[PDB]
Amino acid sequence: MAATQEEIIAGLAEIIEEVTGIEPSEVTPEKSFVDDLDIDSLSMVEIAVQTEDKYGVKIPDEDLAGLRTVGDVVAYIQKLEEE
Template identity: 55%
Template sequence: MAHSEDEILAGLAEIVNEETGLPTDAVTTDKSFTEDLDIDSLTMMTVVSVAEEKFGVTIPDEEVKNLATVGDAVRYIAQAQS
């Protein structure tokens, strides 16, 4: 069962909230993980790891550096699950 992009965004926001304490409404598609959300590489790996399990996808380590914004991650996950 594929998740819609809105569902993926909501799910990512929940993960970021649990891992960092940032409010879910701060996690929007235009935000940069590093610049705007202050997420370091270890935390990013954790977010990716939890997201992989939640959405049933695999995000290879070498792809993670290309996911600059929340929107990048949403689109990647949406495509990866199809």
């Protein structure tokens, strides 16, 4: 129940690659989806859809807007895993 931060980023970066094309070398826990990675709000929706399909992590719409950095998504997934 303790999927590590590196493991979550590794699984998230290979979805970000397929959605956008950004290499997992660029997906670091301090990058902003809008500013640094340039991932619009409609690509985040499919990142979340594929995350739920692959790892079972469900992220609703109201909470998906408040995840600005990759670290925010990792923290959300870890806090959801903690239960």
